[PDB]
Amino acid sequence: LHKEPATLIKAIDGDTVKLMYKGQPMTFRLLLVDTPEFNEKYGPEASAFTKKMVENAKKIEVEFDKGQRTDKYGRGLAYIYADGKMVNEALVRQGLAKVAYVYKGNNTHEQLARKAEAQAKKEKLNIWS
Ligand SMILES: Cc1cn([C@H]2C[C@H](OP(=O)(O)O)[C@@H](COP(=O)(O)O)O2)c(=O)[nH]c1=O
Ligand SMILES: [Ca+2]
């Protein structure tokens, strides 16, 4: 997989962010994760965690997987990095997202994500408390 440049337009919620990619505004939905909705338990904390990660980043990067790059809503599907740290994995490691929506061919980082969930679970963090 390859990391590509993007710039933050605005945080949206725990698992979607608006970025400018190849000069076009796009909503990205993070691969392999599911955060609670803002109205749900840990939803505000998830939104906060992602917002802080992307707003504080000097460099945001988009990494597409091998499969579908847009979902049925027109959202980009990618792993998003903030100064080299994957947001998708970070949310899971903190117990603020579950591994989810794992579809064959867009699952390169599935094992990394599941390993993070296991650790978050063993720690009883947030969703796992
Ligand atoms: C993460 C992801 C979501 N989706 C679609 C599946 C779900 O369809 P449905 O809307 O019919 O439930 C929706 C959930 O996204 P959200 O968790 O943002 O609601 O996004 C993909 O198709 N591929 C993906 O990789
Ligand atoms: Ca969600």
Tab-separated table of N, CA, C and O and ligand atoms in Angstrom:
chain	number	residue	atom	x	y	z
A	1	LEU	N	0.867	-1.251	0.000
A	1	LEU	CA	0.000	0.000	0.000
A	1	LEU	C	0.862	1.243	0.000
A	1	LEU	O	2.024	1.201	0.394
A	2	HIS	N	0.257	2.377	-0.359
A	2	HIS	CA	1.000	3.608	-0.578
A	2	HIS	C	0.339	4.733	0.182
A	2	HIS	O	-0.880	4.842	0.166
A	3	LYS	N	1.146	5.578	0.808
A	3	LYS	CA	0.605	6.755	1.494
A	3	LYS	C	0.611	7.942	0.545
A	3	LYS	O	1.598	8.173	-0.178
A	4	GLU	N	-0.513	8.665	0.511
A	4	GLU	CA	-0.672	9.815	-0.373
A	4	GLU	C	-1.010	11.037	0.468
A	4	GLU	O	-1.713	10.930	1.474
A	5	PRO	N	-0.602	12.222	0.000
A	5	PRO	CA	-0.937	13.469	0.671
A	5	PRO	C	-2.412	13.798	0.711
A	5	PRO	O	-3.194	13.522	-0.238
A	6	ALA	N	-2.791	14.436	1.809
A	6	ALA	CA	-4.120	15.080	1.922
A	6	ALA	C	-3.995	16.209	2.923
A	6	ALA	O	-3.061	16.228	3.701
A	7	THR	N	-4.949	17.148	2.924
A	7	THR	CA	-5.006	18.181	3.965
A	7	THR	C	-6.381	18.138	4.660
A	7	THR	O	-7.411	17.850	4.012
A	8	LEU	N	-6.389	18.408	5.969
A	8	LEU	CA	-7.639	18.457	6.735
A	8	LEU	C	-8.523	19.593	6.225
A	8	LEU	O	-8.061	20.759	6.130
A	9	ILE	N	-9.790	19.284	5.939
A	9	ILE	CA	-10.805	20.370	5.790
A	9	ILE	C	-11.553	20.501	7.123
A	9	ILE	O	-11.605	21.599	7.694
A	10	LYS	N	-12.071	19.397	7.672
A	10	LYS	CA	-12.681	19.466	9.008
A	10	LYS	C	-12.972	18.095	9.588
A	10	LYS	O	-13.289	17.137	8.873
A	11	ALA	N	-12.831	17.993	10.884
A	11	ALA	CA	-13.276	16.817	11.593
A	11	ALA	C	-14.787	16.684	11.511
A	11	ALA	O	-15.514	17.718	11.392
A	12	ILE	N	-15.264	15.436	11.415
A	12	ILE	CA	-16.704	15.198	11.424
A	12	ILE	C	-17.134	14.420	12.637
A	12	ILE	O	-17.822	14.988	13.506
A	13	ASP	N	-16.733	13.147	12.711
A	13	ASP	CA	-17.008	12.363	13.919
A	13	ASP	C	-15.915	11.297	14.140
A	13	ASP	O	-14.856	11.438	13.602
A	14	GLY	N	-16.157	10.272	14.948
A	14	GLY	CA	-15.059	9.361	15.316
A	14	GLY	C	-14.459	8.648	14.124
A	14	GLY	O	-13.245	8.413	14.074
A	15	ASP	N	-15.273	8.388	13.104
A	15	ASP	CA	-14.757	7.550	11.994
A	15	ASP	C	-14.955	8.151	10.604
A	15	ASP	O	-14.748	7.466	9.606
A	16	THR	N	-15.281	9.443	10.542
A	16	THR	CA	-15.328	10.121	9.240
A	16	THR	C	-14.677	11.507	9.424
A	16	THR	O	-14.720	12.132	10.500
A	17	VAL	N	-14.013	11.924	8.371
A	17	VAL	CA	-13.283	13.204	8.375
A	17	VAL	C	-13.336	13.756	6.957
A	17	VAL	O	-13.285	13.005	5.980
A	18	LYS	N	-13.369	15.096	6.846
A	18	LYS	CA	-13.385	15.690	5.504
A	18	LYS	C	-11.969	16.176	5.171
A	18	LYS	O	-11.354	16.897	5.962
A	19	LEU	N	-11.424	15.672	4.071
A	19	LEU	CA	-10.071	16.005	3.700
A	19	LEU	C	-10.062	16.468	2.280
A	19	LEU	O	-10.950	16.148	1.477
A	20	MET	N	-9.040	17.223	1.946
A	20	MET	CA	-8.869	17.528	0.542
A	20	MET	C	-7.823	16.572	-0.043
A	20	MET	O	-6.683	16.492	0.423
A	21	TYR	N	-8.258	15.817	-1.054
A	21	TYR	CA	-7.450	14.738	-1.644
A	21	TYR	C	-7.412	14.982	-3.164
A	21	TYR	O	-8.476	15.115	-3.794
A	22	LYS	N	-6.193	14.979	-3.706
A	22	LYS	CA	-5.896	15.394	-5.090
A	22	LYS	C	-6.715	16.638	-5.411
A	22	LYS	O	-7.249	16.789	-6.537
A	23	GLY	N	-6.726	17.564	-4.455
A	23	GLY	CA	-7.315	18.892	-4.660
A	23	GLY	C	-8.826	18.970	-4.610
A	23	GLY	O	-9.390	20.037	-4.950
A	24	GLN	N	-9.490	17.880	-4.207
A	24	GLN	CA	-10.958	17.835	-4.182
A	24	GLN	C	-11.423	17.541	-2.765
A	24	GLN	O	-10.817	16.685	-2.101
A	25	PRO	N	-12.470	18.247	-2.300
A	25	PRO	CA	-13.008	17.939	-0.949
A	25	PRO	C	-13.691	16.591	-0.939
A	25	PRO	O	-14.462	16.289	-1.846
A	26	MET	N	-13.404	15.754	0.068
A	26	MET	CA	-14.003	14.426	0.100
A	26	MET	C	-14.191	14.040	1.555
A	26	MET	O	-13.375	14.413	2.372
A	27	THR	N	-15.288	13.349	1.846
A	27	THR	CA	-15.469	12.737	3.165
A	27	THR	C	-14.835	11.386	3.105
A	27	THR	O	-15.180	10.606	2.218
A	28	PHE	N	-13.943	11.092	4.066
A	28	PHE	CA	-13.374	9.778	4.185
A	28	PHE	C	-13.976	9.012	5.344
A	28	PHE	O	-14.218	9.585	6.415
A	29	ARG	N	-14.304	7.730	5.123
A	29	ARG	CA	-14.756	6.839	6.192
A	29	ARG	C	-13.624	5.874	6.449
A	29	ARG	O	-13.042	5.316	5.547
A	30	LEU	N	-13.270	5.739	7.729
A	30	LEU	CA	-12.089	4.946	8.089
A	30	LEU	C	-12.335	3.445	7.917
A	30	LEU	O	-13.324	2.887	8.413
A	31	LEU	N	-11.435	2.804	7.180
A	31	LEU	CA	-11.517	1.337	7.006
A	31	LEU	C	-11.413	0.578	8.331
A	31	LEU	O	-10.630	0.969	9.242
A	32	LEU	N	-12.174	-0.529	8.431
A	32	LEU	CA	-12.034	-1.591	9.444
A	32	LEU	C	-12.524	-1.202	10.846
A	32	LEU	O	-12.391	-1.998	11.793
A	33	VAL	N	-13.174	-0.032	10.979
A	33	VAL	CA	-13.603	0.353	12.299
A	33	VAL	C	-15.048	0.841	12.358
A	33	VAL	O	-15.656	1.194	11.325
A	34	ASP	N	-15.571	0.839	13.576
A	34	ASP	CA	-16.883	1.448	13.837
A	34	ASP	C	-16.837	2.152	15.169
A	34	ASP	O	-16.738	1.511	16.255
A	35	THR	N	-16.932	3.482	15.110
A	35	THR	CA	-17.112	4.237	16.339
A	35	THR	C	-18.580	4.397	16.654
A	35	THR	O	-19.398	4.433	15.720
A	36	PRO	N	-18.912	4.633	17.938
A	36	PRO	CA	-20.341	4.893	18.294
A	36	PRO	C	-20.774	6.216	17.643
A	36	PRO	O	-19.937	7.071	17.380
A	37	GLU	N	-22.069	6.381	17.365
A	37	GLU	CA	-22.560	7.640	16.808
A	37	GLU	C	-22.422	8.693	17.890
A	37	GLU	O	-22.310	8.358	19.070
A	38	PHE	N	-22.390	9.965	17.493
A	38	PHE	CA	-22.234	11.023	18.471
A	38	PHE	C	-23.277	10.958	19.601
A	38	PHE	O	-22.973	11.228	20.784
A	39	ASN	N	-24.510	10.592	19.249
A	39	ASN	CA	-25.581	10.469	20.232
A	39	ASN	C	-25.468	9.263	21.192
A	39	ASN	O	-26.264	9.123	22.123
A	40	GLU	N	-24.479	8.394	20.962
A	40	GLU	CA	-24.371	7.124	21.709
A	40	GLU	C	-23.257	7.179	22.721
A	40	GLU	O	-22.408	8.035	22.646
A	41	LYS	N	-23.221	6.205	23.628
A	41	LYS	CA	-22.147	6.121	24.596
A	41	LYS	C	-20.756	5.996	23.951
A	41	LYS	O	-20.561	5.215	23.023
A	42	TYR	N	-19.801	6.749	24.500
A	42	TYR	CA	-18.452	6.978	23.908
A	42	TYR	C	-18.379	7.651	22.558
A	42	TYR	O	-17.272	7.762	21.992
A	43	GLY	N	-19.537	8.017	22.009
A	43	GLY	CA	-19.581	8.730	20.737
A	43	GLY	C	-18.869	10.077	20.776
A	43	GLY	O	-17.996	10.330	19.971
A	44	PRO	N	-19.177	10.904	21.777
A	44	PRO	CA	-18.491	12.174	21.874
A	44	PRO	C	-17.008	11.969	22.099
A	44	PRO	O	-16.213	12.719	21.536
A	45	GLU	N	-16.626	10.990	22.924
A	45	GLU	CA	-15.190	10.742	23.136
A	45	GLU	C	-14.479	10.278	21.873
A	45	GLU	O	-13.343	10.673	21.631
A	46	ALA	N	-15.113	9.402	21.113
A	46	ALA	CA	-14.546	9.029	19.802
A	46	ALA	C	-14.357	10.204	18.862
A	46	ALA	O	-13.304	10.335	18.229
A	47	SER	N	-15.396	11.021	18.727
A	47	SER	CA	-15.314	12.218	17.866
A	47	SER	C	-14.170	13.120	18.332
A	47	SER	O	-13.381	13.590	17.520
A	48	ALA	N	-14.059	13.296	19.652
A	48	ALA	CA	-13.013	14.126	20.224
A	48	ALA	C	-11.627	13.613	19.942
A	48	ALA	O	-10.710	14.411	19.643
A	49	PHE	N	-11.483	12.291	19.998
A	49	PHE	CA	-10.171	11.671	19.830
A	49	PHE	C	-9.712	11.833	18.401
A	49	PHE	O	-8.586	12.261	18.155
A	50	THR	N	-10.595	11.553	17.457
A	50	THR	CA	-10.242	11.728	16.058
A	50	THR	C	-9.942	13.198	15.703
A	50	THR	O	-8.968	13.486	14.971
A	51	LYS	N	-10.803	14.094	16.159
A	51	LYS	CA	-10.646	15.546	15.923
A	51	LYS	C	-9.265	15.991	16.386
A	51	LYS	O	-8.543	16.709	15.669
A	52	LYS	N	-8.901	15.594	17.597
A	52	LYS	CA	-7.616	16.014	18.150
A	52	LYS	C	-6.486	15.445	17.308
A	52	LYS	O	-5.534	16.132	16.987
A	53	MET	N	-6.613	14.194	16.886
A	53	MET	CA	-5.534	13.577	16.147
A	53	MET	C	-5.306	14.285	14.802
A	53	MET	O	-4.175	14.606	14.431
A	54	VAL	N	-6.392	14.587	14.099
A	54	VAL	CA	-6.243	15.147	12.746
A	54	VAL	C	-5.949	16.634	12.803
A	54	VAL	O	-5.195	17.108	11.965
A	55	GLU	N	-6.490	17.361	13.794
A	55	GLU	CA	-6.306	18.813	13.834
A	55	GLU	C	-4.871	19.110	14.256
A	55	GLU	O	-4.329	20.132	13.851
A	56	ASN	N	-4.283	18.253	15.090
A	56	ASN	CA	-2.948	18.522	15.670
A	56	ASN	C	-1.853	18.085	14.687
A	56	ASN	O	-0.675	18.382	14.898
A	57	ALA	N	-2.240	17.300	13.669
A	57	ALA	CA	-1.257	16.713	12.775
A	57	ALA	C	-0.638	17.772	11.871
A	57	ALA	O	-1.338	18.610	11.290
A	58	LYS	N	0.677	17.733	11.753
A	58	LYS	CA	1.344	18.532	10.734
A	58	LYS	C	1.157	17.940	9.334
A	58	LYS	O	1.164	18.668	8.343
A	59	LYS	N	1.035	16.635	9.257
A	59	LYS	CA	0.910	15.939	7.968
A	59	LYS	C	-0.148	14.842	8.021
A	59	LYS	O	-0.027	13.886	8.806
A	60	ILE	N	-1.179	14.980	7.198
A	60	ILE	CA	-2.155	13.914	7.078
A	60	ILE	C	-1.862	13.124	5.798
A	60	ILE	O	-1.541	13.714	4.734
A	61	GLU	N	-2.004	11.808	5.877
A	61	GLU	CA	-1.870	10.980	4.680
A	61	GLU	C	-3.068	10.026	4.573
A	61	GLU	O	-3.612	9.538	5.569
A	62	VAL	N	-3.411	9.711	3.333
A	62	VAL	CA	-4.447	8.757	2.954
A	62	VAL	C	-3.770	7.511	2.368
A	62	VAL	O	-2.882	7.647	1.498
A	63	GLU	N	-4.186	6.329	2.805
A	63	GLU	CA	-3.690	5.098	2.250
A	63	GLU	C	-4.869	4.248	1.834
A	63	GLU	O	-5.554	3.724	2.705
A	64	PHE	N	-5.089	4.047	0.523
A	64	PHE	CA	-6.149	3.151	0.097
A	64	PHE	C	-5.706	1.705	0.185
A	64	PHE	O	-4.522	1.414	0.154
A	65	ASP	N	-6.667	0.818	0.366
A	65	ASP	CA	-6.391	-0.603	0.344
A	65	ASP	C	-6.555	-1.121	-1.103
A	65	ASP	O	-6.612	-0.319	-2.039
A	66	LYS	N	-6.586	-2.445	-1.274
A	66	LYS	CA	-6.525	-3.059	-2.608
A	66	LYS	C	-7.867	-3.095	-3.337
A	66	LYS	O	-7.925	-3.510	-4.499
A	67	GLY	N	-8.945	-2.869	-2.600
A	67	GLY	CA	-10.281	-2.984	-3.115
A	67	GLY	C	-10.974	-1.663	-3.344
A	67	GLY	O	-10.361	-0.684	-3.819
A	68	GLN	N	-12.269	-1.654	-3.047
A	68	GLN	CA	-13.147	-0.492	-3.218
A	68	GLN	C	-12.558	0.749	-2.567
A	68	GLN	O	-12.166	0.696	-1.387
A	69	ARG	N	-12.497	1.862	-3.295
A	69	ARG	CA	-11.971	3.120	-2.727
A	69	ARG	C	-13.048	4.156	-2.351
A	69	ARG	O	-12.757	5.157	-1.701
A	70	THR	N	-14.284	3.884	-2.752
A	70	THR	CA	-15.453	4.711	-2.404
A	70	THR	C	-16.541	3.760	-1.916
A	70	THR	O	-16.667	2.644	-2.452
A	71	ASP	N	-17.352	4.171	-0.946
A	71	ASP	CA	-18.459	3.340	-0.600
A	71	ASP	C	-19.734	3.839	-1.323
A	71	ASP	O	-19.666	4.738	-2.164
A	72	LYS	N	-20.877	3.260	-0.994
A	72	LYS	CA	-22.111	3.537	-1.719
A	72	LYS	C	-22.640	4.943	-1.463
A	72	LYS	O	-23.583	5.406	-2.195
A	73	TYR	N	-22.069	5.611	-0.464
A	73	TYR	CA	-22.421	6.994	-0.135
A	73	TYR	C	-21.473	7.996	-0.776
A	73	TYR	O	-21.628	9.215	-0.580
A	74	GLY	N	-20.492	7.485	-1.512
A	74	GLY	CA	-19.458	8.363	-2.091
A	74	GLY	C	-18.330	8.773	-1.149
A	74	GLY	O	-17.574	9.714	-1.444
A	75	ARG	N	-18.308	8.178	0.036
A	75	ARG	CA	-17.186	8.406	0.966
A	75	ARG	C	-15.949	7.653	0.544
A	75	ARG	O	-16.043	6.486	0.136
A	76	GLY	N	-14.779	8.292	0.676
A	76	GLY	CA	-13.503	7.584	0.439
A	76	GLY	C	-13.320	6.558	1.550
A	76	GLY	O	-13.808	6.786	2.662
A	77	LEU	N	-12.786	5.394	1.193
A	77	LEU	CA	-12.503	4.339	2.187
A	77	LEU	C	-11.001	4.189	2.310
A	77	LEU	O	-10.328	3.833	1.333
A	78	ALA	N	-10.431	4.564	3.470
A	78	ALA	CA	-8.957	4.521	3.523
A	78	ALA	C	-8.459	4.340	4.958
A	78	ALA	O	-9.235	4.477	5.876
A	79	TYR	N	-7.156	4.060	5.115
A	79	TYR	CA	-6.473	4.199	6.414
A	79	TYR	C	-5.936	5.624	6.443
A	79	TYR	O	-5.382	6.092	5.450
A	80	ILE	N	-6.186	6.364	7.529
A	80	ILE	CA	-5.749	7.750	7.605
A	80	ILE	C	-4.642	7.889	8.643
A	80	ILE	O	-4.734	7.262	9.708
A	81	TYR	N	-3.559	8.568	8.272
A	81	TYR	CA	-2.388	8.733	9.153
A	81	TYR	C	-2.222	10.166	9.572
A	81	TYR	O	-2.386	11.115	8.764
A	82	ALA	N	-1.919	10.349	10.856
A	82	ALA	CA	-1.651	11.691	11.348
A	82	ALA	C	-0.201	11.681	11.848
A	82	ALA	O	0.129	11.000	12.833
A	83	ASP	N	0.661	12.431	11.173
A	83	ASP	CA	2.099	12.426	11.495
A	83	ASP	C	2.606	11.004	11.672
A	83	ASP	O	3.271	10.664	12.666
A	84	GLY	N	2.208	10.145	10.746
A	84	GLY	CA	2.730	8.771	10.689
A	84	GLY	C	1.988	7.736	11.535
A	84	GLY	O	2.295	6.536	11.449
A	85	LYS	N	1.020	8.193	12.349
A	85	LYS	CA	0.265	7.300	13.218
A	85	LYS	C	-1.109	7.066	12.602
A	85	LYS	O	-1.826	8.030	12.276
A	86	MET	N	-1.450	5.801	12.458
A	86	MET	CA	-2.746	5.449	11.878
A	86	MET	C	-3.887	5.769	12.843
A	86	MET	O	-3.999	5.235	13.935
A	87	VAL	N	-4.813	6.617	12.387
A	87	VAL	CA	-6.003	6.949	13.210
A	87	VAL	C	-6.873	5.734	13.449
A	87	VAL	O	-7.358	5.495	14.563
A	88	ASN	N	-7.091	4.933	12.407
A	88	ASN	CA	-7.981	3.779	12.503
A	88	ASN	C	-7.503	2.855	13.649
A	88	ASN	O	-8.313	2.483	14.515
A	89	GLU	N	-6.205	2.503	13.625
A	89	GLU	CA	-5.675	1.597	14.640
A	89	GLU	C	-5.726	2.280	16.013
A	89	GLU	O	-5.969	1.605	17.015
A	90	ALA	N	-5.429	3.576	16.058
A	90	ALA	CA	-5.354	4.307	17.353
A	90	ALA	C	-6.710	4.300	18.053
A	90	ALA	O	-6.795	4.097	19.264
A	91	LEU	N	-7.796	4.464	17.279
A	91	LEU	CA	-9.136	4.489	17.865
A	91	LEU	C	-9.381	3.104	18.474
A	91	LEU	O	-9.937	2.973	19.555
A	92	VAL	N	-9.070	2.060	17.709
A	92	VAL	CA	-9.319	0.680	18.204
A	92	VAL	C	-8.482	0.422	19.479
A	92	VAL	O	-8.985	-0.096	20.461
A	93	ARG	N	-7.211	0.852	19.479
A	93	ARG	CA	-6.330	0.582	20.610
A	93	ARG	C	-6.860	1.272	21.856
A	93	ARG	O	-6.617	0.827	22.954
A	94	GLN	N	-7.549	2.394	21.675
A	94	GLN	CA	-8.092	3.109	22.838
A	94	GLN	C	-9.482	2.666	23.266
A	94	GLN	O	-10.075	3.273	24.184
A	95	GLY	N	-10.004	1.621	22.638
A	95	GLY	CA	-11.355	1.162	22.981
A	95	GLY	C	-12.440	2.161	22.583
A	95	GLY	O	-13.497	2.197	23.211
A	96	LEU	N	-12.162	2.990	21.585
A	96	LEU	CA	-13.149	3.999	21.114
A	96	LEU	C	-13.825	3.579	19.775
A	96	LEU	O	-14.654	4.331	19.216
A	97	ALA	N	-13.379	2.441	19.234
A	97	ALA	CA	-13.954	1.815	18.021
A	97	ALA	C	-13.822	0.315	18.130
A	97	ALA	O	-12.885	-0.185	18.778
A	98	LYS	N	-14.768	-0.395	17.514
A	98	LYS	CA	-14.665	-1.862	17.368
A	98	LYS	C	-14.137	-2.128	15.960
A	98	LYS	O	-14.419	-1.346	15.029
A	99	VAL	N	-13.382	-3.223	15.790
A	99	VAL	CA	-13.079	-3.708	14.452
A	99	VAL	C	-14.412	-4.082	13.836
A	99	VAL	O	-15.212	-4.774	14.490
A	100	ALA	N	-14.627	-3.670	12.589
A	100	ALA	CA	-15.951	-3.865	11.949
A	100	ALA	C	-15.826	-3.640	10.455
A	100	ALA	O	-14.857	-3.081	9.976
A	101	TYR	N	-16.851	-4.076	9.719
A	101	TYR	CA	-16.901	-3.839	8.288
A	101	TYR	C	-15.635	-4.354	7.595
A	101	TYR	O	-15.085	-3.721	6.688
A	102	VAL	N	-15.258	-5.587	7.947
A	102	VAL	CA	-14.087	-6.179	7.376
A	102	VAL	C	-14.469	-6.982	6.124
A	102	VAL	O	-15.037	-8.105	6.190
A	103	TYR	N	-14.171	-6.401	4.973
A	103	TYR	CA	-14.638	-7.002	3.710
A	103	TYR	C	-13.418	-7.496	2.964
A	103	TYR	O	-12.383	-6.845	2.944
A	104	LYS	N	-13.511	-8.691	2.375
A	104	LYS	CA	-12.358	-9.262	1.675
A	104	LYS	C	-11.758	-8.292	0.655
A	104	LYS	O	-12.486	-7.570	-0.028
A	105	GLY	N	-10.429	-8.227	0.595
A	105	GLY	CA	-9.764	-7.268	-0.312
A	105	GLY	C	-9.582	-5.801	0.107
A	105	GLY	O	-8.803	-5.071	-0.504
A	106	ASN	N	-10.317	-5.339	1.113
A	106	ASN	CA	-9.964	-4.103	1.801
A	106	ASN	C	-9.631	-4.445	3.235
A	106	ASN	O	-10.132	-3.799	4.158
A	107	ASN	N	-8.759	-5.428	3.432
A	107	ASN	CA	-8.466	-5.857	4.797
A	107	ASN	C	-7.000	-6.031	5.117
A	107	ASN	O	-6.644	-6.812	5.979
A	108	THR	N	-6.145	-5.263	4.457
A	108	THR	CA	-4.708	-5.397	4.657
A	108	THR	C	-4.319	-5.258	6.135
A	108	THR	O	-3.527	-6.080	6.648
A	109	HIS	N	-4.935	-4.303	6.840
A	109	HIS	CA	-4.501	-4.054	8.220
A	109	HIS	C	-5.401	-4.725	9.239
A	109	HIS	O	-5.452	-4.318	10.402
A	110	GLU	N	-6.136	-5.764	8.819
A	110	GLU	CA	-7.064	-6.427	9.747
A	110	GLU	C	-6.384	-7.017	10.973
A	110	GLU	O	-6.833	-6.806	12.103
A	111	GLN	N	-5.266	-7.710	10.761
A	111	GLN	CA	-4.580	-8.296	11.902
A	111	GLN	C	-4.034	-7.266	12.893
A	111	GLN	O	-4.178	-7.451	14.098
A	112	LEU	N	-3.480	-6.172	12.368
A	112	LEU	CA	-2.994	-5.061	13.191
A	112	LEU	C	-4.197	-4.531	14.003
A	112	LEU	O	-4.095	-4.310	15.207
A	113	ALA	N	-5.339	-4.308	13.333
A	113	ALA	CA	-6.484	-3.755	14.025
A	113	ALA	C	-6.990	-4.720	15.112
A	113	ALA	O	-7.334	-4.312	16.233
A	114	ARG	N	-7.083	-5.998	14.769
A	114	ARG	CA	-7.570	-6.963	15.733
A	114	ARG	C	-6.635	-7.097	16.915
A	114	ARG	O	-7.065	-7.288	18.047
A	115	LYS	N	-5.338	-6.927	16.657
A	115	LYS	CA	-4.385	-7.008	17.741
A	115	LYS	C	-4.612	-5.837	18.712
A	115	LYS	O	-4.604	-6.000	19.947
A	116	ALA	N	-4.890	-4.672	18.157
A	116	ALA	CA	-5.185	-3.494	18.986
A	116	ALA	C	-6.455	-3.678	19.786
A	116	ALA	O	-6.560	-3.264	20.933
A	117	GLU	N	-7.481	-4.230	19.144
A	117	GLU	CA	-8.735	-4.456	19.883
A	117	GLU	C	-8.520	-5.413	21.069
A	117	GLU	O	-9.098	-5.221	22.143
A	118	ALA	N	-7.735	-6.453	20.836
A	118	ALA	CA	-7.471	-7.396	21.891
A	118	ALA	C	-6.822	-6.720	23.065
A	118	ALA	O	-7.175	-7.005	24.226
A	119	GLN	N	-5.877	-5.817	22.784
A	119	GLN	CA	-5.153	-5.133	23.840
A	119	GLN	C	-6.138	-4.198	24.560
A	119	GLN	O	-6.237	-4.196	25.774
A	120	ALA	N	-6.921	-3.430	23.790
A	120	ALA	CA	-7.929	-2.555	24.414
A	120	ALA	C	-8.937	-3.314	25.252
A	120	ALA	O	-9.333	-2.877	26.354
A	121	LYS	N	-9.342	-4.468	24.750
A	121	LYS	CA	-10.202	-5.330	25.515
A	121	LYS	C	-9.559	-5.861	26.798
A	121	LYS	O	-10.215	-5.907	27.845
A	122	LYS	N	-8.283	-6.229	26.729
A	122	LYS	CA	-7.629	-6.829	27.901
A	122	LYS	C	-7.489	-5.761	28.978
A	122	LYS	O	-7.524	-6.065	30.191
A	123	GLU	N	-7.353	-4.510	28.528
A	123	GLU	CA	-7.272	-3.339	29.429
A	123	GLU	C	-8.623	-2.815	29.922
A	123	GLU	O	-8.664	-1.904	30.759
A	124	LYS	N	-9.711	-3.392	29.428
A	124	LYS	CA	-11.060	-2.921	29.729
A	124	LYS	C	-11.253	-1.409	29.434
A	124	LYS	O	-11.835	-0.668	30.231
A	125	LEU	N	-10.745	-0.958	28.288
A	125	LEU	CA	-10.778	0.476	27.976
A	125	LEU	C	-12.104	0.907	27.356
A	125	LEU	O	-12.500	0.365	26.332
A	126	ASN	N	-12.734	1.944	27.909
A	126	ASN	CA	-13.819	2.645	27.205
A	126	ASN	C	-14.992	1.745	26.784
A	126	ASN	O	-15.762	1.308	27.642
A	127	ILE	N	-15.127	1.419	25.499
A	127	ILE	CA	-16.209	0.518	25.107
A	127	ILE	C	-16.162	-0.842	25.851
A	127	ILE	O	-17.208	-1.473	26.080
A	128	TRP	N	-14.955	-1.272	26.234
A	128	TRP	CA	-14.739	-2.579	26.859
A	128	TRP	C	-14.777	-2.529	28.369
A	128	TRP	O	-14.504	-3.547	29.044
A	129	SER	N	-15.079	-1.354	28.911
A	129	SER	CA	-15.187	-1.219	30.366
A	129	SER	C	-16.525	-1.714	30.917
A	129	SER	O	-17.598	-1.212	30.562
B	1	LIG	C1	-16.440	1.082	6.708
B	1	LIG	C2	-17.318	0.722	5.536
B	1	LIG	C3	-18.641	1.082	5.553
B	1	LIG	N1	-19.434	0.753	4.467
B	1	LIG	C4	-20.915	1.048	4.508
B	1	LIG	C5	-21.648	-0.145	5.140
B	1	LIG	C6	-22.858	0.434	5.940
B	1	LIG	O1	-24.021	0.459	5.028
B	1	LIG	P1	-25.331	0.870	5.821
B	1	LIG	O2	-25.403	2.371	5.902
B	1	LIG	O3	-26.475	0.360	4.795
B	1	LIG	O4	-25.502	0.337	7.290
B	1	LIG	C7	-22.324	1.882	6.258
B	1	LIG	C8	-21.944	2.054	7.733
B	1	LIG	O5	-21.132	3.268	7.816
B	1	LIG	P2	-21.334	4.085	9.181
B	1	LIG	O6	-20.833	3.283	10.380
B	1	LIG	O7	-20.582	5.451	8.942
B	1	LIG	O8	-22.882	4.348	9.491
B	1	LIG	O9	-21.198	2.106	5.424
B	1	LIG	C9	-18.877	0.153	3.392
B	1	LIG	O10	-19.604	-0.226	2.420
B	1	LIG	N2	-17.588	-0.217	3.364
B	1	LIG	C10	-16.774	0.070	4.439
B	1	LIG	O11	-15.611	-0.276	4.359
B	2	CA	CA	-19.999	4.698	12.961
